[PDB]
Amino acid sequence: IAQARKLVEQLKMEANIDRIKVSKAAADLMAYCEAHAKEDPLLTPVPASENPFR
Amino acid sequence: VWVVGMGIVMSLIVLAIVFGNVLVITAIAKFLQTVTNYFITSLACADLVMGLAVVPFGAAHILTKTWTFGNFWCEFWTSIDVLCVTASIETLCVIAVDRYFAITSPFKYQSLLTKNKARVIILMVWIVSGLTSFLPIQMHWYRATHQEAINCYAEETCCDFFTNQAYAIASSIVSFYVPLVIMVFVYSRVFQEAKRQLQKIDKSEHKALKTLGIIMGTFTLCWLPFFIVNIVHVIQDNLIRKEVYILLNWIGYVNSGFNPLIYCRSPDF
Amino acid sequence: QRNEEKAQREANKKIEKQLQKDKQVYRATHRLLLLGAGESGKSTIVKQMRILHVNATKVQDIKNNLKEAIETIVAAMSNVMNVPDFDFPPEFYEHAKALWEDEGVRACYERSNEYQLIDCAQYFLDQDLLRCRVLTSGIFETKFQVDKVNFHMFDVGGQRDERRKWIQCFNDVTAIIFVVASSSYNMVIREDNQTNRLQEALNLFKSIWNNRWLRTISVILFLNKQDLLAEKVLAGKSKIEDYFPEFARYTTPEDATPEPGEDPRVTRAKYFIRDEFLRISTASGDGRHYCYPHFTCAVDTENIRRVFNDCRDIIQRMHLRQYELL
Amino acid sequence: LDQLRQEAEQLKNQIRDARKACADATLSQITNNIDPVGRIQMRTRRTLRGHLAKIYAMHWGTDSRLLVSASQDGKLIIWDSYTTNKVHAIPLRSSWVMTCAYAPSGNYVACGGLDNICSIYNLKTREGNVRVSRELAGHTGYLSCCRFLDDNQIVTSSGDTTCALWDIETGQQTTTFTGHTGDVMSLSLAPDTRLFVSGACDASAKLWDVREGMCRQTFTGHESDINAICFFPNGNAFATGSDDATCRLFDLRADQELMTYSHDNIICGITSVSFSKSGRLLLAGYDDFNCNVWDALKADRAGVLAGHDNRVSCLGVTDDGMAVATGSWDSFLKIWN
Ligand SMILES: Nc1nc2c(ncn2[C@@H]2O[C@H](COP(=O)(O)OP(=O)(O)OP(=O)(O)O)[C@@H](O)[C@H]2O)c(=O)[nH]1
Ligand SMILES: CN[C@@H]1CCc2c(ccc(O)c2O)[C@H]1O
């Protein structure tokens, strides 16, 4: 019967955490993608001269 | 006026053989490659070669009523069509033979036949087929001894078939008698095995007859009329005309045109 | 370096040469997977294939099962046992032996259906090496040859799984061997309040038969434990009618092939259980599915030809399915 | 006794109230001004043959040149992608293999399967004789994934709703994680190897801690089993591929589900997911005999890779983001670019 006692102890731990708005996380992800989009060989094809597989 | 119109029939039939056969050859190689597909590929290649290198020449000779090339070309044409007809039939015997262990010896089928054995048997049967046609044709050892073929052999414009008795009998035997009885025995046993397997299944708790009957009947009906006269007209004293000879030869040629349609019906095809 | 690639190219040749030899061996083997419920007898069948045909903890293991069997019946007879690693002393073996003669214990053995008890309780207290239950978690395998042919028999086993998510791995086996207990129609399995053991095995068979991945695998059915079935029917303890009401209206099939000497009552009960398993397979069996029922006894029927003959028919029918014959 | 369950309902409802308050605006409304990537087409550059049976496992190397594959024929073949030459072929003691790995330093390879035992092999040894180094055998049930933190630490996830952090030197579990109610199917370490996640069969995922060995969060947005999972290159997001047609992207800081990737004409499952170098494309395998390419910020399909003849069971992207390898059940790897 102690399983219920342990389960309610774990759920209270996740209750007290810090959260931020969805807008901030979305902006961070979009900024990271925009910053790193330059060096993405699968996204923007590289010239065949510098292609190890061709 | 039907003479000119009949030329379209030959062109329509001939074009189908070349177009129809290359459809299955390209698909098998570019996609299907198993132990039992090499024989089908060899048969398809033989049919394609026969059609392309035989049918137009015969059609042109029939329509123009005058052979245009020399004696060497006519000898080459006879050699090639005999070789192709001999090799096309003998592959069906191999197909029947190897389909037999699968049904009759499921366990030893994998060990009995492999790629090397299949290649060796294909090469052997091709050599056996080739030895029948080119060697007697080039050696001029089949020439007749009567006074009717002298004009044909002395005129470069003319062309016909007046082969001696012995070579005709031997070729007809070694090209039709051996495969037919073997394939009949093979397909008889397969039917019995299915029946027991059907009887056993029924005890525990006619598609095969239809398919075996169709397979047998199509080529036997197409080929037996041509190979039944090759003994008779030589044995008899001019009891068989030449127009019926040509017509039955063309009927026999037709068989391999739709033989690949009868075969090669697997879902993966 | 030009010489750098030459060694690497030669390295591929050595590796690629070994794979050619292994392909022939792999393609010339048959894999059979065992399945069933608990206490069915999957492990016992494997032992028959090892000691017979192709191919010192027994003293302690046999005593381990014997000790637990007597305690369970004696503990519930009224209606130290769990001390860790207690060895069998000379007095310990003598002390446990005397409890069998008690008449009060005998009455508890007569009502063994009500509670849970191991089958081998009577044999060990009063083929011997294989009449013992020892459980193993890791997949149990076995390699043997019958006639110049390689057979690979394995049992995934494990503790009960209600999800069986690993079943998609066995999508290429030759056949599935199914073992059921046909003398356990009045016992409750591992819960003490549930459907009887036979119904629990029937539900498992229905799920296995109607499976997404196993749409082209035949099943061999081993209606095991035929020895106890004749004993239960002979006695008047329990009747099939009480647990299975459909037995009242059942009749003996016309196509009946009993043994040399067998009572009509025993033969009817044998075929009722077999026929009930067959209606499930035929309901959704439309080609490429077959069931082969046998009346096998795991311990006292030594013949591997039953698996050998059925496997040949499976492949023979599989070839007949190709080329559009049957 | 009974009052504890009643109190648990209040705590459960507390979580939903906080999450619903943080939903300022959906991601789709934010990124309506982003120009679409367009149509992405890739052509096969290499094909690797030599496996006798279907394939479940695959992993690249740090040099992004050599990869290792596993199959149920009992072989563990190491390839050289540039020149297509097998370098090794290790026979296995068991014929049932469900996972493989590759050490960051390239000196070790891991394996495991239905035998409930993880094995570690040695590659760079004296006299060139590969042999089993250790045999980690403490579990109950089949293994699903293995990962390498360094040459000494390995993380496994068996089918008994548990995980562990092994220790090759001593062959004993340093710590164990519990809390799932269903079989664990996959895991993926963080870029800094300080956190990792796991997708169980109870339609939930958790964010464990390597050091403390305790659970931190729990996301329960799915409706069926979970078969794949992978971290964002940033390290603050991960995408999940479930048994239904949908794949969802979660956020660690916002503690909610951001977007859902689904199509009307797809009714199959997903067996493997992976991102790109910059986290702009989300490749995902399928039972539809092909691999689809999604868009991280638009949920728009942007190409199909359908060069296979059987189901796709593994997928991976090189460290430099130059090629994509997709194995299948017909024993044929393929390198796309
Ligand atoms: N009387 C009788 N007992 C049998 C027979 N076959 C097996 N048993 C019993 O089987 C027991 C051995 O354990 P099993 O029931 O085989 O257990 P198991 O096969 O490991 O169990 P599972 O893995 O769940 O199938 C012994 O107690 C035997 O009495 C049989 O034909 N007759
Ligand atoms: C002119 N056409 C020939 C004539 C005789 C002949 C053919 C085929 C096979 C043979 O064994 C033959 O004897 C025909 O193709």
φ, ψ of residue B186 to 5 degrees: the values are: -60, -50
Report the first-to-last Cα separation within chain C, whole angstroms. 61
Measure the CA–CA gap between B50 and B70, rounded to whole angstroms.
21
Measure the CA–CA gap between C166 and D142, rounded to whole angstroms.
9
Interface residue C23 vs chain D (CB under 8 A): yes
Alpha helices in chain C (DSSP H): 2-27, 42-51, 58-77, 90-97, 103-110, 121-125, 197-209, 226-234, 240-243, 264-284, 305-321
Interface residue D132 vs chain A (CB under 8 A): no
Measure the CA–CA gap between D190 and C313, rounded to whole angstroms.
54
Measure the CA–CA gap between D2 and D7, rounded to whole angstroms.
9
| CB C230 less than 6 A from any atom of ligand 1 | no
Query: Is the separation of the CB atoms in D297 and A33 below 8 Å?
Result: yes
Give CB contacts under 8 A, 24+ apart, made by C53-62: C53/C144, C53/C146, C53/C304, C54/C144, C54/C145, C54/C146, C55/C142, C55/C143, C55/C144, C58/C129, C61/C132, C61/C134, C62/C124, C62/C128, C62/C129, C62/C132
How far CA B74 is from CA of B77, B153, C226, in Å, comes to 5, 11, 80
Chain A contacts in chain D segment 158-217 (CB below 8 A): 179, 215-217
Query: Is the separation of the CB atoms in D97 and D57 below 8 Å?
Result: yes
Judged by CB atoms closer than 8 Å, whether chains meet at D201 and C166 is answered as no
Measure the CA–CA gap between D238 and D253, rounded to whole angstroms.
12
**Ligand minimally distant from the alpha carbon of residue C190:** 1
Measure the CA–CA gap between C276 and C293, rounded to whole angstroms.
11
Place of tokens 């009717």: B148
How far CA B99 is from CA of B25, B105, C144, D243, in Å, comes to 21, 10, 29, 43
Q: Enter the tokens of residue C142.
A: 């076995």
The helix/strand/coil state of B132 is helix
- C44 is a catalytic site residue: yes
Query: Which has the closest alpha carbon to D297: A37, A41, A42, A44?
Result: A37
Instruction: Give the distance (Å) from ligand 1 centre to CA of residue C38.
Output: 9
The helix/strand/coil state of B230 is helix
The helix/strand/coil state of C35 is strand
Residue type, D278: S
Measure the CA–CA gap between A1 and B175, rounded to whole angstroms.
88
Measure the CA–CA gap between C118 and C81, rounded to whole angstroms.
16
CA angle B48–B51–B54, rounded 5-degree value: 135
Residue type, D327: G
Query: Which has the closest alpha carbon to D243: D265, D259, D266, D264?
Result: D266
The helix/strand/coil state of B197 is helix
Query: Is the separation of the CB atoms in B172 and B230 below 8 Å?
Result: yes
Interface residue C323 vs chain B (CB under 8 A): yes
Residue type, D8: A
Measure the CA–CA gap between D84 and C265, rounded to whole angstroms.
70
Query: Which has the closest alpha carbon to D51: D313, D306, D284?
Result: D313
Partners of D229 in beta bridges: D240
Query: Which has the closest alpha carbon to D88: D104, D71, D67, D105?
Result: D67
Q: Enter the tokens of residue D97.
A: 């293999």
Chains that touch C (3 or more CB pairs under 8 A): B, D
Q: In what order do the strands lie in the sheet with D324-328?
A: D44-48, D333-336, D324-328, D312-317
How far CA D141 is from CA of B237, C133, C171, in Å, comes to 88, 21, 20
Query: Which has the closest alpha carbon to D196: D205, D204, D313?
Result: D205
Neighbours of D28 (CB within 10 A): 13
Place of tokens 């003994």: B231
Class of domain C1-326: alpha beta
Place of tokens 């964002």: D232
Helix (H) or strand (E) holding D312: strand D312-317
Measure the CA–CA gap between D282 and D301, rounded to whole angstroms.
10
Judged by CB atoms closer than 8 Å, whether chains meet at A40 and D5 is answered as no
Neighbours of A11 (CB within 10 A): 16
Query: Is the separation of the CB atoms in C167 and C213 below 8 Å?
Result: yes
Helix (H) or strand (E) holding B244: helix B242-262
Mutate to test the interface with C, among B34, B202, B205 (most CBs of C within 10 A): B205
φ, ψ of residue D258 to 5 degrees: the values are: -90, -60
Measure the CA–CA gap between C202 and C208, rounded to whole angstroms.
10
- C296 is a catalytic site residue: no
Helix, strand and coil in chain D, % to nearest 5: 10, 40, 50
Residue A26 belongs to what domain range? Answer: 1-53
Provide the shortest C-alpha distance from residue D87 to chain C (in Å). 7
Instruction: Give the distance (Å) from ligand 1 centre to CA of residue B205.
Output: 29
Query: Is the separation of the CB atoms in B207 and C325 below 8 Å?
Result: yes
How far CA B107 is from CA of C147, C188, D66, in Å, comes to 10, 43, 40
The helix/strand/coil state of B256 is helix
Domain ranges of chain B: 2-262
C142: alpha, beta or left? (left if phi > 0; alpha if psi -120 to 50): beta
Across C259-292, b (16+ Cβ under 10 Å) vs e yields eeeeeeebbbbbbbbbeebbeebeeebeeebbbb
C148: alpha, beta or left? (left if phi > 0; alpha if psi -120 to 50): left
Please report how the helices B2-30 and B242-262 are oriented relative to each other, as an axis angle in degrees rounded to 10.
Answer: 30
Judged by CB atoms closer than 8 Å, whether chains meet at D80 and C8 is answered as yes
Query: Is the separation of the CB atoms in D146 and D154 below 8 Å?
Result: yes
Q: Enter the tokens of residue B206.
A: 């006619």
Pairing of strands C29-36, C150-155: parallel
Query: Which has the closest alpha carbon to A18: B202, B147, D252?
Result: D252
Resolution limit, Å: 3.5
Measure the CA–CA gap between D57 and D68, rounded to whole angstroms.
8
- D74 DSSP assignment: T
Judged by CB atoms closer than 8 Å, whether chains meet at C316 and B207 is answered as no
- C247 DSSP assignment: G
Judged by CB atoms closer than 8 Å, whether chains meet at C149 and B107 is answered as yes
B249 known ligand binder? yes
Pairing of strands D257-261, D247-251: antiparallel
Judged by CB atoms closer than 8 Å, whether chains meet at C28 and B211 is answered as no
* Method used to determine the 3D structure: cryo-EM
Instruction: Give the distance (Å) from ligand 2 centre to CA of residue B41.
Output: 23
Indicate which residue of C44, C200, C268, C296 is catalytic. Answer: C44
The helix/strand/coil state of C266 is helix
Q: In what order do the strands lie in the sheet with D291-295?
A: D273-275, D281-284, D291-295, D304-305
Instruction: Give the distance (Å) from ligand 2 centre to CA of residue B82.
Output: 5
The four Cα atoms B241, B245, B248, B253 give a dihedral, to 10 degrees, of -170
Indicate which residue of C1, C20, C57, C159 is catalytic. Answer: C159
Query: Which has the closest alpha carbon to D216: D255, D164, D160, D161?
Result: D255
How far CA B92 is from CA of B80, B251, D166, in Å, comes to 20, 18, 63
Neighbours of A48 (CB within 10 A): 8
CA angle D292–D294–D299, rounded 5-degree value: 140
Query: Which has the closest alpha carbon to C230: C276, C179, C270?
Result: C270
Measure the CA–CA gap between C12 and C21, rounded to whole angstroms.
15
Instruction: Enumerate residues 6+ apart whose C-beta is below 8 A from D39.
Output: D302, D303
Q: Enter the tokens of residue C100.
A: 């069998």
Pairing of strands C218-224, C291-294: parallel
Measure the CA–CA gap between C304 and C295, rounded to whole angstroms.
14
Residue type, C259: E
Please report how the helices B207-235 and B178-204 are oriented relative to each other, as an axis angle in degrees rounded to 10.
Answer: 160
Partners of C180 in beta bridges: C223
How far CA D290 is from CA of C300, D266, D279, D284, D306, in Å, comes to 53, 12, 21, 9, 4
Helix (H) or strand (E) holding B169: helix B165-172
Query: Which has the closest alpha carbon to D336: C32, C9, C176, A51?
Result: A51
Q: Enter the tokens of residue A49.
A: 């001269």
Query: Which has the closest alpha carbon to C230: C269, C275, C186, C188?
Result: C269
- B130 DSSP assignment: H
Query: Is the separation of the CB atoms in B200 and B193 below 8 Å?
Result: no
Alpha-carbon Rg for chain D, nearest whole angstrom, is: 20
- D62 DSSP assignment: T
D303: alpha, beta or left? (left if phi > 0; alpha if psi -120 to 50): left
Measure the CA–CA gap between D240 and D261, rounded to whole angstroms.
10
Provide the shortest C-alpha distance from residue D184 to chain C (in Å). 11
Partners of D312 in beta bridges: D328
Mutate to test the interface with C, among D51, D52, D118, D135 (most CBs of C within 10 A): D52
Query: Is the separation of the CB atoms in D300 and D277 below 8 Å?
Result: no
Query: Which has the closest alpha carbon to C276: C142, C174, C171, C185?
Result: C185
**Ligand minimally distant from the alpha carbon of residue C181:** 1
Mutate to test the interface with A, among D253, D298, D305, D319 (most CBs of A within 10 A): D253
Burial class (CB in 10 A: 0-12, 13-18, 19+), C45: buried
Alpha-carbon Rg for chain B, nearest whole angstrom, is: 21
The helix/strand/coil state of B198 is helix
Query: Which has the closest alpha carbon to C237: C229, C227, C226, C245?
Result: C229
Cβ contacts of B212 on chain C, cutoff 8 Å: 325
Measure the CA–CA gap between D296 and D249, rounded to whole angstroms.
9
- Count of helix runs (H) and strand runs (E) in chain C: 11, 6
| CB B161 less than 6 A from any atom of ligand 2 | yes
Alpha-carbon Rg for chain C, nearest whole angstrom, is: 24
The helix/strand/coil state of B51 is helix
Query: Which has the closest alpha carbon to C142: C42, C220, C57?
Result: C42
Number of domains in chain A: 1
Interface residue C26 vs chain D (CB under 8 A): yes
Q: In what order do the strands lie in the sheet with C29-36?
A: C140-145, C150-155, C29-36, C175-181, C218-224, C291-294
Helix, strand and coil in chain A, % to nearest 5: 60, 0, 40
Neighbours of C298 (CB within 10 A): 22
Query: Is the separation of the CB atoms in C232 and C183 below 8 Å?
Result: yes
- Tally of residues, chain A: 54
Domain ranges of chain C: 1-326
Residues contributing to the annotated binding site of C: 36-44, 129-136, 155-159, 224-227, 298
Measure the CA–CA gap between C277 and B177, rounded to whole angstroms.
53
- D35 DSSP assignment: P
Measure the CA–CA gap between D194 and D176, rounded to whole angstroms.
15
Measure the CA–CA gap between B1 and D84, rounded to whole angstroms.
66
Please report how the helices C264-284 and C197-209 are oriented relative to each other, as an axis angle in degrees rounded to 10.
Answer: 30
Instruction: Give the distance (Å) from ligand 1 centre to CA of residue C183.
Output: 11
The CATH number given to whatever domain includes residue A25 is 4.10.260.10
Judged by CB atoms closer than 8 Å, whether chains meet at D140 and C159 is answered as yes
Residue of minimum CA distance from atom 9 in ligand 2: B82
Half-sphere exposure of residue B241, counting CA atoms within 13 Å on the CB side? 3
Query: Is the separation of the CB atoms in C88 and C63 below 8 Å?
Result: yes
Indicate which residue of C155, C197, C200, C296 is catalytic. Answer: C155
Residue type, D253: R
- B100 DSSP assignment: H
Alpha helices in C135-263 (DSSP H): 197-209, 226-234, 240-243
Helix (H) or strand (E) holding D258: strand D257-261
Instruction: Give the distance (Å) from ligand 1 centre to CA of residue C299.
Output: 9
Measure the CA–CA gap between C189 and C42, rounded to whole angstroms.
17
Judged by CB atoms closer than 8 Å, whether chains meet at C316 and B200 is answered as no
Pairing of strands C150-155, C140-145: antiparallel
- C255 is a catalytic site residue: no
The helix/strand/coil state of D151 is coil
Residue type, B62: I
| CB B175 less than 6 A from any atom of ligand 2 | yes
Query: Is the separation of the CB atoms in C89 and C148 below 8 Å?
Result: no
Please give the interface size between C and D, counted as residue pairs whose CB atoms are below 8 Å apart: 52
Across B61-90, b (16+ Cβ under 10 Å) vs e yields beeeeebeeebeebebbbbbbbbbbbbbbb
| CB C120 less than 6 A from any atom of ligand 1 | yes
Query: Is the separation of the CB atoms in C46 and C55 below 8 Å?
Result: no
- B141 DSSP assignment: T
Pairing of strands D44-48, C175-181: unpaired
Query: Is the separation of the CB atoms in D220 and D204 below 8 Å?
Result: yes
Query: Is the separation of the CB atoms in D53 and D72 below 8 Å?
Result: yes
Query: Is the separation of the CB atoms in D216 and A14 below 8 Å?
Result: yes
**Ligand minimally distant from the alpha carbon of residue C232:** 1
Instruction: Enumerate residues 6+ apart whose C-beta is below 8 A from D86.
Output: C11, C12, C15, C16, D50, D77, D78, D79, D80
Measure the CA–CA gap between D269 and D292, rounded to whole angstroms.
12
Measure the CA–CA gap between D113 and C159, rounded to whole angstroms.
17
**Domain topology for B2-262:** Rhopdopsin 7-helix transmembrane proteins (1.20.1070)
φ, ψ of residue C135 to 5 degrees: the values are: -95, 145
The helix/strand/coil state of B217 is helix
Q: Enter the tokens of residue C139.
A: 């997949």
Residue type, C310: D
| CB B164 less than 6 A from any atom of ligand 2 | no
Query: Which has the closest alpha carbon to D245: D288, D185, D274?
Result: D288
